[PDB]
Design a protein around this ligand. Sequence first.
Ligand code: HEM
Ligand code: HEM
Ligand code: CL
Ligand code: OH
Ligand code: OH
Lengths: 178, 179
Amino acid sequence: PNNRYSFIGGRTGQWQVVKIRNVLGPGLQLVEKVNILNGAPLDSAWRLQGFASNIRYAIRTELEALQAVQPMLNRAEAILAVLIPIKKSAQWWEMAQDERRDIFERESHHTAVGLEYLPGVARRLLHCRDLGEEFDFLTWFEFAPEHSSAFNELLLRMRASKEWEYVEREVEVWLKRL
Amino acid sequence: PNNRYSFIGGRTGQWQVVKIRNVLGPGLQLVEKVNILNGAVPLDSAWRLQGFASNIRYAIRTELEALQAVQPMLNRAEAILAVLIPIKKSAQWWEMAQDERRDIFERESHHTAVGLEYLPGVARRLLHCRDLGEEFDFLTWFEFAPEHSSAFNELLLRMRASKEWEYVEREVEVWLKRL
Ligand code: HEM
Ligand code: HEM
Ligand SMILES: [Cl-]
Ligand SMILES: [O-]
Ligand SMILES: [O-]
């Protein structure tokens, strides 16, 4: 599959690691670089993988709003990135669809809050629970240096939300584009 | 992992192939048997399908609770017939937003309400495979005593008349008998 992406921490890649912050639960080993590959090698400490998939929660009017402002990846100015792997608890995944949507948006305003940080912050969402991975999602953010304060504020805002009562594991990997 | 299943059409397995109906689009080659394996993966085998069990995508809590009231376990003794139905939906289905797909699925189509009429005759399992890059999007599995083949067939004619099924672009029925 080429909806599949792998991220390999180790000594080679497009991206220098700048910092890793072990927010919640067990961390990831610090390494020099992350190599990103479309598909599924020595001197590598960890590999994470996920796939791009269909929309799970956003309704039409939210999609139209996102599409009006969201930027593309690979802007020349967007030389910083942040890879944030996330795992949610088993109680999250047993809930029904309405219960989860209600937490994600009605209670937490995930989409409304995130829209306040576009178009500065470009984003990608990959899924991995269904592959058996140690994390449920691989989230990817890239932005110009001007926006790193704003991005740090977004994170504090999201982590205070009801949605985040269900996050069990979270790591931040700050990257600079080589 | 544990959540992945493979279905191999060939000369071995636990299920005998009674008929294959090539309902829509290209079919599957007729084979003698189906082997079902927990895991990902075939010498005298003609085709191999796979999918994963996953979280709920559409049902709401009160639907889940009704379903959970009545739905039968798999591998009942009398449940000697099974039907494997691989399904592919169109690209236009997958671009739509979540509310739009939910509204087609239940509000316009009453998938869950219509299906609930046929429990506990029919037991079922749903497996996902679009995200794996498979040639189908879903493997659906249904098992029942012979007493319900008629009713199962009526369900199918019903569901295929629905708005949901206007987005279905490939469908095969593999009818099976347990060995
Ligand atoms: C930058 C602005 C952001 C926007 C516009 C945004 C928007 C979205 C949207 C629309 C979804 C739903 C996709 C769907 O329906 O399938 C989503 C999912 C998700 N986002 Fe964000 N997001 C933002 C920032 C963040 C941040 C900063 C994090 C992590 C620290 C994050 C973590 C996630 C996760 C883990 C999911 C998957 C949720 C689930 O399926 O349970 N998002 N986001
Ligand atoms: C027999 C009684 C049935 C019941 C109780 C039933 C119930 C359900 C439910 C509740 C879902 C949505 C699961 C979710 O929220 O993730 C579903 C999905 C689905 N069903 Fe059924 N169903 C039945 C019959 C059938 C039949 C006969 C077929 C095929 C010919 C079928 C094909 C599918 C497909 C392909 C999906 C996934 C649809 C999607 O995600 O786009 N179902 N069913
Ligand atoms: Cl795989
Ligand atoms: O996101
Ligand atoms: O189903």
